[PDB]
């Protein structure tokens, strides 16, 4: 159905749809693993299904159209608890590339493409716990897709070489976020 923000459990899979109250988005849940988002001059969101908790080893795969027009990004997304961490494995995006004026750290070649890696900060913003500073782990694809399966253990052992270290599991999904934009995306997890 279409939902308005919150988590559970949907078909089997879990979902998250997150907003900032800024109007212009439609988060709809369908059936099994898959789930579509339309938005018109958004704010930001991020919307999506997958597993709660997440694993370390899952090989997830995703498929389907995603079109945004301007700032968008389609994502393996998730968190870890001690230490507090929100992490992209970022398979596409739109017309800003998310490691923008962060440092570079690594790369990691994964599921048929480089990935670059960073670390970034956010400072008292939205979080699983609530308002909170954080940082953030971005692998960044270089080979924009739309379908494929993204082995997360290579992702998350190259983070760890970098000292990138996770804590404990919190949910793991595809997730389509938007940025002040517009956009359709209609997407499938397993
Ligand atoms: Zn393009
Ligand atoms: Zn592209
Ligand atoms: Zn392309
Ligand atoms: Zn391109
Ligand atoms: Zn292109």
Not at 112 to 125: A, C, F
Not at 140 to 160: I, P, Y
């Amino acid at each position: 159905q279409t939902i308005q923000p919150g988590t559970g459990y949907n078909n089997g899979y879990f979902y998250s749809y997150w907003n900032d109250g800024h109007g212009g988005v439609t988060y709809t849940n369908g059936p099994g693993g898959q789930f579509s988002v339309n938005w018109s001059n958004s704010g930001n969101f991020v919307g999506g299904k997958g597993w709660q908790p997440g694993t370390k080893n899952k090989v997830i795969n995703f498929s389907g159209s995603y079109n945004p027009n301007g700032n968008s990004y389609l994502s393996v997304y998730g968190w870890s608890r001690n230490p507090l961490i929100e992490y992209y494995i970022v398979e596409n995006f739109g017309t800003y590339n998310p490691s923008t004026g962060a440092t570079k750290l690594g790369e990691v070649t994964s599921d048929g493409s480089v990935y670059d890696i960073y670390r970034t900060q956010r400072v008292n913003q939205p979080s699983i716990i609530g308002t909170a500073t954080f940082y953030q782990y971005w692998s960044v694809r270089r080979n924009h897709r739309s379908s494929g399966s993204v082995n997360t253990a290579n992702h998350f052992n190259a983070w760890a070489q970098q000292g990138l270290t996770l804590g404990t599991m919190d949910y793991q999904i595809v997730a389509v976020e938007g940025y002040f934009s517009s956009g359709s995306a209609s997407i499938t997890v397993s």
